[PDB]
Amino acid sequence: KEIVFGTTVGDFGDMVKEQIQAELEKKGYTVKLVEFTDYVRPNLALAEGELDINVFQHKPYLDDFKKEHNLDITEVFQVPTAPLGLYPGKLKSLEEVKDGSTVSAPNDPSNFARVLVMLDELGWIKLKDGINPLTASKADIAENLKNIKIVELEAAQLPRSRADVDFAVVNGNYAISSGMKLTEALFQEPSFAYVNWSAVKTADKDSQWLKDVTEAYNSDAFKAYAHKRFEGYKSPAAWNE
Amino acid sequence: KEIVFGTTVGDFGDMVKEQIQAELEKKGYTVKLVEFTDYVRPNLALAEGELDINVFQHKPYLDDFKKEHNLDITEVFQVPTAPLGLYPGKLKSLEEVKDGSTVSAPNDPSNFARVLVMLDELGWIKLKDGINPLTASKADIAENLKNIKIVELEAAQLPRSRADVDFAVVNGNYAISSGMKLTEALFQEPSFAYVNWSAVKTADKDSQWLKDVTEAYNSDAFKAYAHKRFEGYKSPAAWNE
Amino acid sequence: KEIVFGTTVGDFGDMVKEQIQAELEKKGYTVKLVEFTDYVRPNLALAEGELDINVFQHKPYLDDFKKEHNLDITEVFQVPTAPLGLYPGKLKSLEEVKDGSTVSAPNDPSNFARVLVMLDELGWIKLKDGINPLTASKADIAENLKNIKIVELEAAQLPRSRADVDFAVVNGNYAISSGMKLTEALFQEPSFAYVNWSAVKTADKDSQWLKDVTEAYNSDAFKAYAHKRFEGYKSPAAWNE
Amino acid sequence: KEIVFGTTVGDFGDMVKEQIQAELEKKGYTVKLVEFTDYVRPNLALAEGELDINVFQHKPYLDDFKKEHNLDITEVFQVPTAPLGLYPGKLKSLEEVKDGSTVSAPNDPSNFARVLVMLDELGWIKLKDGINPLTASKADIAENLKNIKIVELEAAQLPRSRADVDFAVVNGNYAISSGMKLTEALFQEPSFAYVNWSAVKTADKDSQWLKDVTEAYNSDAFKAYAHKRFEGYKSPAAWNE
Amino acid sequence: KEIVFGTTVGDFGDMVKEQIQAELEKKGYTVKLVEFTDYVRPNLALAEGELDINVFQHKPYLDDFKKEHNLDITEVFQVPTAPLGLYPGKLKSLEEVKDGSTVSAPNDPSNFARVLVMLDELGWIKLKDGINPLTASKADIAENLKNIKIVELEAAQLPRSRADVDFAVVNGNYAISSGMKLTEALFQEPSFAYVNWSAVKTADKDSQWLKDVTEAYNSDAFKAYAHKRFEGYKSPAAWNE
Amino acid sequence: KEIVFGTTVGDFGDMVKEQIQAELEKKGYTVKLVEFTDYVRPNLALAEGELDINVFQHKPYLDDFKKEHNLDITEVFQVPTAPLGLYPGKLKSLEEVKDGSTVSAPNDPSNFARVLVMLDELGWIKLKDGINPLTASKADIAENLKNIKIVELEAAQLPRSRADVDFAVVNGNYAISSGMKLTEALFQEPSFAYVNWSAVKTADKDSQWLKDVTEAYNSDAFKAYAHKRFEGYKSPAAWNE
Ligand code: MET
Ligand code: MET
Ligand code: MET
Ligand code: MET
Ligand code: MET
Ligand code: MET
C-alpha cells in the first residue's frame, strides 16, 4: 500500500521524511511525498486522487476551500503548527506604529481574517461587535483607528514583503522556510483555532491506512521528535499538554 | 523539445490530440497533454513549470487569477471558444420566468460578472449605470427587477444544476462535455470579450516553440477542422471572419 | 490501482475523461488514458502490458487481429459507437454515381468487408450468394455492376481522401475527429455487428478492476451521458434499448 | 532540462526545495529531489544515472568511496554544512568522563577518523605524531589515555545511541533531523576540511546545467537564506567569510 | 536517450547485459532489456514502439514475418548465432534411423524449411530440383525416402520433444538455454544464411543511437568476449573470419 | 504476487529466466528480474524494498555487509556457484611466477581473504599459523615468500586487469560474464565455504512465496538443468552430492 502525502515546503514535509515515513514503513507501507509551494493546489490534488492525504492547512481554510470548490474532503488529525506572527518590517517595534502605517497580510479570506483579529487585539483597528472571528472581513471593521493601510499579498510573498511595509503578518510555514525565527515576532496570534489538520477524501475516512497514519502522528516517538525539532510550535489540542 | 499542454477536459484537449499535435510532430516536437477538471489548477501548474502552455480561460479570468495568485504568466493567442449560454432548467423558455425564479451561476468573480451582465441584458435585473461589466458584482445591482434568486455553484456543477434551478448559465466547455448543445441555449452572450486565450510563462513569450504552436493554431488546416468540429463556437478575433 | 486505458483519439477518449474516470476515482482507482491515431498499435500495447484495457475496435477486427498476431486478449463489453457512413467526396449525392466512380475504403480486411457489403446494399456491386458478410472480399464479388474503382487506404486517411475520390467510406471515429457529421453521410451501414468492444488480456478477465470498469460503462449515469453527448451512435446490444 | 538532485533527508533537501529549486526554475529547468537516509546509496544512484547531482558528503568520504567502488564522479562546489559534535549521552558533561567511558562513532573510515582526531583534541586519547588526520585509524593511536571504549555504529544509528553510551559523536545531518541542536554539543569539530560538496558524474562537469546549479548555490540570495535558516553551519571556503 | 532492446531468453540477452549495455552507458545512453519466450511477439513489440531494437531472428524469418504482419521494420547488423542442429531423442545416432522414424521440427515456415533441407542433406527425404531453399515446404518434397514422420511444434517446445520423438531439430537459442550443448548435435546445419540480425523500425535506420549500437556489436572488445562466451557460434559475415 | 529478483548479470540471472521464472509462473506468480554489475547495490535494493530476493553473494560477504550497513536481511538457500580462480594475465603459467610478480585481487574484505588463502596454498605467501581463513588480511601474512605485489581493485575490474598484472584472481560471476572460461584458471579455490546464497528481508523469511522460490531452486528439474547449463559449478550443500 503506497500512501501519497502532500505538504507545503519545509516543516510539514520534514515531519514526513524524518519521522512519519519510517514509522509507516515498519508497518509495510511505502510513502511518497509531494511538496507544494502554494496553498491552493493541495486540496484539489487530494480531491482528484493524486494525493491520499495532505498536511498544510487549518480548518477554517479547509472549510472555506472545500465549500467554494465543492470538494468531498475532511479533516482527520492535528499536527504541530508554526504560529502566526506580526514581524518587523521597515519598523522594528510595535510602539513605532504611526497613522497610516502599512501592514502586509495574506489575501485569502480565512487567513486575512486572522490579521484583522490581530490588528484589533493590538488596538490598531476596531472590529464590529458580535462578528464571527473566523470570517472577519473589511466590512466588519467598525473603525480603522490608526488608519492602517493593509497591503494584501499572496501568502508566499509575505516574508519578502518586510522590505516594502512597516510590519508583516507572516504565516508560520513561510516564515520558517524563509529563515525567519518565531521569536522575531513582535506579536504572536494567541488563538489555537488555526492549529493545522491533515485532510483526506471522505471516502477514505475509515481506512486502515489512515488509522496507521493517525497513530504515527500521535505516537510518543513523534511527540518527542516534534518537541525538539519544532520548538515554539502549537500542539494538537488532543495532545492535551 | 517536448511541449506540455494543459487544457480543461473535452473540446480544448481534442483540438490538441486531433489536430495540433500532428502539426507540431511534423516540426520535430513531441507533445504531452494534461487535462484538468477545474479552472484553478491549470495556471498554477503552468507557473510552477509543470506545463509549457495552457488553453482553457478568457482574459478577465487570467487577469484576476494571476493578480490574486502572483503569477508571472501572460496570454498569447485566441482559440475557438464555446460561448456562454443560459439554458433551460426546470423552466424551458425565457417567457416562463417568474418573480423569484432561480438561476444558477458560477461562483468565481470573472465568470459571475458575466451572469449579472446577461441577466441585465434579459431585463431580469438592472445594473447600475456606468459600472464595468467585466467586474460586475452583487454590489453593482441597482434593482433585482424579477427578484431572481442566483444560486452560486462551482463552475463544473452547472450542467447538473439544471435539475434544481429554473435556468442555468453554463460555461461552454462544461456544457459541451456534459452533452449539452449550444443550440439549446435560450440566450447566448453577445460579447466577444471572453473568447479564450492560451497562456504561457512570460519568460517563454519569445520562444521558437511558442511561435510554432501559435502558427499551428492559426493554420488553414486548423481553421478548416475547427469550423467543422466546433460548430457555433466563437472564433479568434484575428481570424478576421 | 491505476487503470491504463488506450483509445483512439476523440470520442472514445472523451468517454473516459468526461464520465468513466470520475466514476472509477470514486471507487479509489486512478486512471491514465493513452490515445492512438491508428488501429494497429492499441492491441499490441495491450498484449505487452502497456495498457490494461483498450476501447477502439469491433469484434470482427479483434477476432482477426488477435488470431493473426497471436495475442491472448478478449472482448469484454460494448460501448456506444459512431456508425460507418459513405460520405460525399468529389460527388455529392448517390444519384451522381457513374460507371467507374471512385470509392475510398479502409485497407484492412474486416473493415474492407463492410465497404463491399455497403456497395452491394447500394446496388453498385453484386456480391455472391451465401457468403460470410464479415469476411467479404474481392473474390466474393459476383459482378462489379457500376465498375466501381475502390481506392484502399489506411483508415485514418479516409477523411482526407474526399478531395481525391468521388465518395469516401469513413469509420465513425475518424469522421467525428475530422469534423465530419454523421448526418452528412449519404448512406449509413445498417448493421449492428460492428458496435465496438473493450478488450483486455485474458488473464485479467476476472479481475475486480475490470468488474468496476464494466459497471461504469453500464451505469444509468453513463447511459444518460452517452445519449446526450453521442447522438446517433449505436448502443451496446446489452443496453436492450 | 530536468535536474535530479539526491540529498540526505533534512537540511540539504530543504536547501533545494526552499531556495535552489525556484532559482533554477527561473532559468527554465525543472527540479526533482530524491532523499536518502544513508550515506552509501547516493553516490551509487549518481553513478548509475538516477541522479544528476548529489549533495550529502564531504570530500574525504567521496575520495574514499569513489576509489573503493571505482566510480567516475567528482566534487563541484561546497554547501553550508552542519558541523560534527560530541553530544551528551548517559553522561552530560566532558569532565564527567571516566576511565572506560563509552563513545559512539560512525563505522565508515573517513568519518571514524574525525572521531579519533576529536578524542585527541579532548585529551581522551593520544594519536601518533605526523599522521594523516584524514585517515586516522586505530593503528594511529599512540595511547588510549582514558581507555575510551569506542562503539562503532552505522552513522544513522548515532542519535539513538545516546541512550546506550556515555557520549555520542553524531554527524550534523543526522543530529539536525533527529531534533538535536548544534548548541547541545559538548565539543564541536574545529576542522573545516569536512564542509560538504556536491558531486556529479565526471562526464557532466562542463555542462551548462551544472554551471547554473553552481551559480544558484553561490548567489547572494542563497547566502542570505543560508545564514538565516542554517545558523551555526560551516560555510563553503569560496564564500570567503 | 533510452534504448530498449528485445531479445529471446538466454544468449542474446546476455550479450546486452554483459557487454553492450556498458558500452552504450559510457556514451550516455540508458538501456533496458525485455526478453521474450517466443519468436512471434518481438517484431510486434518493435513495430508498436515498446522496443527500439530486437535481436533474435534470422533474415528469412524477418522477411517473411514483416510481409505477413505488415511491419515497417528492417535488419541492421548480424550477431554471433547458435547454429541449428539435429539432436538425439529416443534414438542416439543417425545410423539408427528407421522407416517411419519421427523428427520434431519447428512449425513456422522459415525454420521448417531448414529442417527439410537438413533431412535432404542426410538422405532421409529428397527435395525437388530447382526450389528456393529458404522457402522449402512439404509441397517441395519429391520423395519421403525413409517415410520420416515430421512432428511440427512451436520452436520453444523442441528441447522437451526429445522424450517423444526419435530425433529433434532444435534452434540454437532454445538448445543453449535448455542446457543442451552444440557438440551434442548429430548433424549441424552447414549454412550461414541463418546467422541472426538485429532489427529496427525503418524510421530509425539512420539514427545516431543505432550507429552507436552497431559499433558496440562490432568492436574488438565485443568480438573478444563473444569468441569465448559463445563457443561454437557462427559469426557475422562482415567479421570475415 | 509479483516476485522481484535481483542478481548479478550472467549466470544467476539466466537461472531465473531459463528455469525458475516458469516454475513460479505455473503457481500463479509473476516474476521480475533486475540485474546488477556490482556487489554493493543488490543488498541495498533488497533492504529498501525494490527487490524481494537477491542471488549474488556468499555468506561471509553477506554477514560483513549487513553488519557494516545495519541491514535486516538474511540468507535462505544456496545456488550453484562459479568458483574463484587465479587466471593468466601477462604470465601464462604458475611456474612463471617471479619475485615481485603482480596479482590482482578484489578490494572488499571477505573476497580479499580468499586471495590470501589461495596465495598461501600456492606457496607464494605464508600466512601466520592458525588465523581465521574467513577474515585473512594483510596483517595475517607472516612472510611474503615471493614478494608478491597484490594489486587491489573493485571486483568488476578484475577481468580487464589481466592486461596490467601477471596473474588475476577473478570472481566466477565476473569471469563468466567477461567471456573467460573456468577451465582456463591456473588454480581454482577448493573450499565450499563460498557457495552463494539467496538473501531476503528477515520479515519475509516465513512467507509462502519464499517457500515456493526455495522449492523451485531445489527441484529435480532445476538440478538437472543446472548440471547441464553450469558445468564445473559448486553445488548447494543441501543437494548432498
Ligand atoms: C492554508 S491555511 C494556512 C496554513 C499555515 N500553515 C498556517 O498555519 O498559517
Ligand atoms: C476559466 S474562465 C472560463 C473559460 C470557459 N472556457 C469559458 O469561456 O466560459
Ligand atoms: C478497429 S475496427 C474499426 C473501429 C471503428 N471505431 C469503427 O467502429 O468503425
Ligand atoms: C557522507 S560523509 C558525512 C556527511 C555529513 N553531512 C557530515 O558533514 O558529517
Ligand atoms: C526467429 S528465427 C530463429 C532464430 C534462432 N536464433 C535461430 O538462429 O535459429
Ligand atoms: C558478493 S560475494 C562474491 C560473489 C561471487 N559470485 C563469488 O562467489 O565469488
Numbering used by the authors:
A (entry chain D), B (entry chain C), C (entry chain A), D (entry chain F), E (entry chain B), F (entry chain E): 43 to 283
What did the paper state?
The bacterial periplasmic methionine‐binding protein MetQ is involved in the import of methionine by the cognate MetNI methionine ATP binding cassette (ABC) transporter. MetQ, the substrate‐binding protein (SBP) for MetNI,5, 6 is proposed to play a dual role in transport by either binding l‐methionine for delivery to the translocation pathway of MetNI, or by facilitating d‐methionine uptake through the ligand‐free form when complexed to the transporter. Structural studies of SBPs in their ligand‐bound and ligand‐free forms have revealed a hinge‐bending or “Venus‐flytrap” mechanism where two domains of SBPs adopt their open conformation with an accessible binding site in the absence of substrate; substrate binding stabilizes the closed conformation, where the two domains come together and sequester the substrate. In this study, we report the structures of the Neisseria meningitides MetQ in substrate‐free form and in complexes with l‐methionine and with d‐methionine, along with the associated binding constants determined by isothermal titration calorimetry.
While multiple structures of MetQ methionine‐binding proteins have been determined, they all exhibit the closed conformation with bound l‐methionine, since MetQ has a high affinity for l‐methionine and is always isolated in the liganded form. Superposition of the l‐ and d‐methionine bound MetQ structures reveal their similar conformation, with rmsd ∼0.1 å. Not surprisingly, l‐ and d‐methionine bind to the same site, interacting with the same set of conserved residues. The α‐amino and α‐carboxyl groups of both l‐ and d‐methionine interact with residues R156, N213, and N238 located on one domain of MetQ, while from the other lobe, residues Y81, F98, H100, and Y103 pack around the methionine thioether group. These binding residues are highly conserved among different bacterial MetQ homologs. The hydrogen bonds between the N238 side chain and the methionine α‐amino and α‐carboxyl groups appear to contribute significantly to the binding affinity, since mutation of this residue to alanine weakens the binding of l‐methionine by over 105. Short contacts to the methionine CB group are observed in both structures, with ∼3.3 å distances observed to the Y98 CO in the l‐methionine structure, and to the Y81 OH groups in the d‐methionine structure. The side chains of l‐ and d‐methionine adopt distinct rotameric conformations for the N‐Cα‐Cβ‐Cγ; Cα‐Cβ‐Cγ‐Sδ; and Cβ‐Cγ‐Sδ‐Cε torsion angles, which are approximately −175°, −175°, and −70° for l‐methionine and +170°, −80°, and −60° for d‐methionine; the latter values correspond to −170°, +80°, and + 60°, respectively, for l‐methionine.
